[PDB]
Design a protein around this nucleic acid. Structure first.
Lengths: 44, 149, 116
RNA sequence: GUCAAGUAAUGAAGCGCACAUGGUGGAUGCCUUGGCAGUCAGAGGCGAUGAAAGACGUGACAGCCUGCGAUAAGCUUCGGGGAGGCGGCAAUAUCCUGUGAUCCGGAGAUUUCUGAAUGGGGAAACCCACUUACCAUAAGGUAGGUAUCUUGUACAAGAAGCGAACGAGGGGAAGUGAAACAUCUCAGUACCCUUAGGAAAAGACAUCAAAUGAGAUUCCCCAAGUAGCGGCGAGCGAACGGGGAGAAGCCGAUUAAUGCUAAUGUAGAAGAACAGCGUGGGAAAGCUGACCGUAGUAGGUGAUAGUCCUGUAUUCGAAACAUUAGCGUUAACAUAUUAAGUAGGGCGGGACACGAGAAAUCCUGUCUGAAGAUGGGGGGACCAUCCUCCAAGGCUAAAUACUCCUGACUGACCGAUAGUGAACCAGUACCGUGAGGGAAAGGCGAAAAGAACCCCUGUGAGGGGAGUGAAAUAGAACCUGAAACCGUGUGCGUACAAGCAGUAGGAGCCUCAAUUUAUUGGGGUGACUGCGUACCUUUUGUAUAAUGGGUCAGCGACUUAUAUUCUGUAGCAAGGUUAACCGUUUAGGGGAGCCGUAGGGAAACCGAGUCUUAAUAGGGCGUCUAG
RNA sequence: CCACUGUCGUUGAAAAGCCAGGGGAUGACUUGUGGAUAGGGGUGAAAGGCUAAUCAAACUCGGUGACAGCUGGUUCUCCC
RNA sequence: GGCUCAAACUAGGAGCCGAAGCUGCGGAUUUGAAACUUGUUUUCAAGUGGUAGGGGAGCGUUGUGUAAGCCUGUGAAGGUGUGUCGUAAGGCAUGCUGGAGGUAUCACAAGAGCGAAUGCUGACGUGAGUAACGAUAAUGCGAGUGAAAAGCUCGCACGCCGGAAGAUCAAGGGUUCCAGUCCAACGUUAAUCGGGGCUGGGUGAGUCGACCCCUAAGGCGAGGCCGAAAGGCGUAGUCG
RNA sequence: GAAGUGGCAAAUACCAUGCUUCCAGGAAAAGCUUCUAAGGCUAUAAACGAAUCGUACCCUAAACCGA
RNA sequence: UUUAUUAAAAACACAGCACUCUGCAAACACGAAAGUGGACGUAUAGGGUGUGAUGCCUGCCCGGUGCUGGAAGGUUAAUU
RNA sequence: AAUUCCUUGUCAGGUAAGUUCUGACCUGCACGAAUGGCAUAAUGAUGGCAGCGCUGUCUCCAGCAGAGACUCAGUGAAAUCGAAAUCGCAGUGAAGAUGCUGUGUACCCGCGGCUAGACGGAAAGACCCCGUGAACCUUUACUACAGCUUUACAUUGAAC
RNA sequence: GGGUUCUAACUCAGGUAUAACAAUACCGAGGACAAUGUAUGGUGGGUAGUUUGACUGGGGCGGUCU
């Protein structure tokens, strides 16, 4: 049957990407948290 | 311990023992129940009890012929061999020398001989008096102990 | 002062398992089963240490009964006769003589029979 | 000999037990490159001169990591150093190097793209430009300029973003406790948000005190779990004053450069002294005899080294740049002049230990509103007297808080299920749309000497020889190599017998040792007989058909800090004991304070008594010793 | 595009399917791409439906080691 | 089982069996008692079932001092046997394995003792060589290659789809594409084959698509409005 | 080294963004053609250009979403 | 139309009907406010509620609780 | 009667026989007029009842075809599991026994079936009670708050 | 001690200019109202936090509680 993921690159980069994170104060806190944990993947 | 904030599975239904955290002390990699923290091991020793114990130690050294009284133990040059020869003629190759005003070259002479130490009487401790096989006290240091105890 | 308990645990479990030698299956192999097998063996040995004293007297009495009935009276009358004759010989020695010395047991029975 | 009757022995498809010998597995032990907790110092930022984080590149050589940036494991220079070197896995090749390489330290040059990202846009590492000067003649190149906001005269200077904790400020829960719960607690905590500095804040009396007065702020030990607050519940919880640390008071105690002077830091240099003999694969261990020591408990080296190496004690170096302090100069800002919409008041809240309470004091949303040194604030309702101090201007070091970090040093901290989640290519793999969650995984050997060659096999795996090595059941999944679990061999038992599988007896067989030779003793097995329904938990009571456990191995639960009471023990003893601090630091000093030495009473007060009472009566509580 | 009946499947081929049938099939239709609404909130031709296999209050992290008069467990030995 | 002048019943009598009760013998231990007097000795008396629980005395383990000691390549720790000793926890000695450490004694401190917690992690059993091997569209044979062929290649025949199970894309993926080579693992069997390993190669545009110009929904939004802060909205515009 | 032109049938594609009807009344902006405001253009050609990125392959699937 | 995944129905919706609110900066809704939707609509419109094509129709009760109107009296806050 | 407890009410019809169905009665436990009343063509994978046709639904199952099951070769799970040398019966017993008593029966080990028991497996019973447990929902429970509304003061003035 | 009037605070989600939104100016319409702040009374399941006893031949119901 139809499953939950249903990928789309435009939608992925527009809802989770680097610019979408950087465009809000809370997304920048997401990025700061990821950098402090040391993740090799910042954003989708 | 890192993480361990979420409940690993639901309380009922899975057939597993109920778990609240993956850092439970029951779990491998979980926290210590009763994890140690830094602590202070210093004890209060009454002033009169410390003085009494030092008095007992000195009396027992005299009774066991471990205390050796000398007029003065001064070394002309900061040389290990000279103090080794002096302790050999004093028949105390390994010893704790107690003097008032430890000389700045008696210190250097004694600093290498293995079971040999030199102390001012104001820095003499009970363990130091008991550990060494002999205690070579000067008469001046013995008088200072007389007045201190 | 962390204490690792592997060495002491190993020698404790080895002690129990070495005491469980000869046991069938898990009772001589796995500690969880072997430890209660060893405890139960100890409990049986404690009870049977009493019951052995109980069982060997039953054996001696049966042998003496056979011997006395072989020449004359029953066990009960034989023991009464010994008691009247003031013979202090215990049932262990009596059964030994019944089994291994028929003439001596015959004479011993004749004494009890003369006493009644 | 034939018949009859009776009665042994013998077997094993498989199985049990014991032992021997393996497999698997990876415990344990020993080990460490990694962690954890601190002490003493330092430092507390990086960024438009483009950060932190990244993308893509970059090598003789494919990848990943490290470094670097189209000048790309790097270029120049100044110092150090002195024979090897071109980073790691990880070698090979071409080569470099006394014309001084590699390497270490200071400075500089270069420094793609993204990212505050800043020329506009955007799905980060991309798309699209405009313009100035120059060059080219084609369709371009080189060097720049072009974001926004703030402050200055369309021009110059700043800012922005990131990042540990600590500070200050603006907002501010609930779980919980009260054995329910709403006041209250939790707690002004978590969290959100703003914004500094090496600290911050506070700070010089419109403060306390009430003593013979003191003399800013901050922090520590007491005062004291006291006075109080409190559905007077649960709880909350001072101050005065005393002992300390540090002390400072001013009217710019500001910031930023520049130059001299001194010191420090960032590479380095020298650095003593052991031989023989036996064992051993190897000596540092053994025996004998030496030597150095201002250097003797360091790390290594084929086993345990003061004299083998690296070191250590000790003595020392700087061309350059940083930092700290002192003096001088420069430029930016500031430089009050005694304080009215202020003090006080009403209303509603908040803060004070203090919940409206008899509620002082402080803050202010709202509404008001002085006196103004012949004056005003405070001294816990309020008044009088007395004392003290002058708000409505600004500043001010130290003692105090902390650790993303740098150096040194330490540990009755861990040692691979521990210690960081991470000893290893870990914030990785993997899981999730995402925020986010989040592993496992160390060890040959002293040295690779990592097994030439031969043989079986498919030129495979795997093995056997050979060889190496002290050792190869140290052969790479490699130290040790446990248990569960699975085999192989040997001995005995087992196919007419009913059940927690043992126990107490007990025949036979097998096997070792003595013994003059089947007799004992040790070991394996166990026909047959008696008895005998696991363990844990929970219960009145469990073989229970009640719970829990497939097994093994490893880990897994009464701790810690403080207060208090009792007991033991030790020192002192009608006395005992200091705390913080100081200290060249377990000593010594520090007597503030605490407990004990007296009780009664609500208290004043009195005191071996005291309270109640008109009572000297009576009665209550005390007296009639050790802390 | 749906999902009415039954068989099968139920350690499935499948964390909702297959087969045989069934309903709508120019409409209040089905569907692609992008966008909006966010948790006591949304959205709902209304079933407390749905809001990423999670819904009478999502998920993640934090308060947090919530509390648990409840259940489980609680490890060496001997003597009174 | 079996039992009838009982092996039933009534009334007596005498023997015997029968418990961890009592006695005998040996040993330990608690308390109290006369003494060389701290277990210094000889005894004596009364005791010694035990859950919750109270009291007492010890064992072992890691670590620190004792210890620059003592032991240890003439073999440490650990592992595995055996013997031996103690009331026990446990101690000691020693064969084998092992290959580099250990620790007397007395104090001192604990991450100090595991069978259970539907405990945690790893390993490995039972079930069991059992179920299953994923559309019932289907295969047979001859050659080839190969260590080996039902499955690979070629051939002949057969079967299935054919509004697809053929072809072109988008989305999504990212090299799976092609060739050579290999078969350990992966592929639910084998494999010489492969979307697996390895090594090479391969994607060529003025016209196709994107980029680009334009805008929709909807974003962001000089100034502006609002809001404790954070921010929310919005004009010109700028994206989409 | 060959042929390669006639009949018939015929789409849901094209004419057709047409036509006819209906009500539920049917994007926007640019490119393009013209007009001017403040202040080069049109024909003829000739020569020379048109950058960058994607393009393999699956795509009713063994390559996507479902471990 | 609906309980994605045990209920498809008599449940929901529905055209139609009624009551009531709303004079426009509408009522009403989101929002802290600015700003929005309602609506670039305007009582033949918009909101809320009930009922539910159509045919025939829809009786009595205003005590209670709401809603609407009224204000003579009683009571009544801050305040003063 | 989607409403009627008593109740299978009564009477009529339909069947050989009808607690259901249809018609009627009215004694409506406890219908009733927009929480609409009574009907109603058409429509419905809607409910009840009755027929024709048709049949393996059944009497009563038989034969056949393919896929498993079964055997061989290759690969190779699962839940469960204290340990097992794991029989019946009548008793006993924490009260329903493979395991205890007595007794009966039974030589050792597979394979194909089977499901009567192992209070078989699965899920710390959802029923029920308990806990000074949770949640969400309701209201004329309590206490609050948002919102709406009243007045006073302020913004806020002048004249008659 | 109330009404009436006025305009000048205040309001306009009116018109005209200011490109637009907003503001500003003028005009127009309202007008000491409205609106907002503080205080205060009412209302207020719209929303929050909670409570809603025990004994009991199970519990509820009933009864009981000194």
């Amino acid at each position: 049957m139809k499953r939950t993921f249903q990928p789309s690159v435009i939608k992925r980069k527009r809802t989770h990407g680097f610019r979408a994170r950087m465009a809000t104060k809370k997304g920048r806190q997401v990025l700061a948290r990821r950098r402090a944990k040391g993740r090799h993947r910042l954003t989708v | 311990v890192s993480g361990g904030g979420i409940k690993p599975w639901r309380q009922k239904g899975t057939g597993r023992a109920r778990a609240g955290s993956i850092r439970s002390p029951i779990w491998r990699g979980g926290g210590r129940a009763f994890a140690a923290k830094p602590q202070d091991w210093s004890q209060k020793v009454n002033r009169k009890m410390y003085r009494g114990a030092m008095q007992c130690i000195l009396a027992e050294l005299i009774r066991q012929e471990r205390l050796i009284l000398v007029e003065e133990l001064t070394i002309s040059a900061p040389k290990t061999k000279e103090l080794i020869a002096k302790l050999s003629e004093l028949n105390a190759p390994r010893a704790l020398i107690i003097t008032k005003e430890v000389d700045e070259n008696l210190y250097l002479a004694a600093r290498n001989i293995p079971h040999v130490n030199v102390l001012d009487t104001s820095e003499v401790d009970p363990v130091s008096l008991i550990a060494f096989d002999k205690v070579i006290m000067s008469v001046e240091a013995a008088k200072q102990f007389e007045e201190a105890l | 002062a962390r204490v690792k308990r592997g060495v002491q645990a190993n020698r404790r479990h080895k002690k129990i398992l070495k005491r469980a030698k000869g046991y069938y299956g898990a009772r001589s192999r796995v500690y969880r089963v072997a430890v209660q097998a060893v405890t139960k063996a100890g409990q049986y040995a404690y009870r049977d240490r009493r019951n052995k004293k109980r069982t060997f007297r039953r054996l001696w009495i049966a042998r003496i009964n056979a011997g006395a009935r072989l020449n004359g009276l029953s066990y009960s009358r034989f023991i009464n006769g010994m008691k009247k004759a003031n013979i202090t010989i215990d049932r262990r020695v009596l059964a030994d003589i019944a089994m291994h010395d028929a003439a001596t047991f015959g004479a011993l029975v004749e004494k009890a029979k003369a006493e009644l």
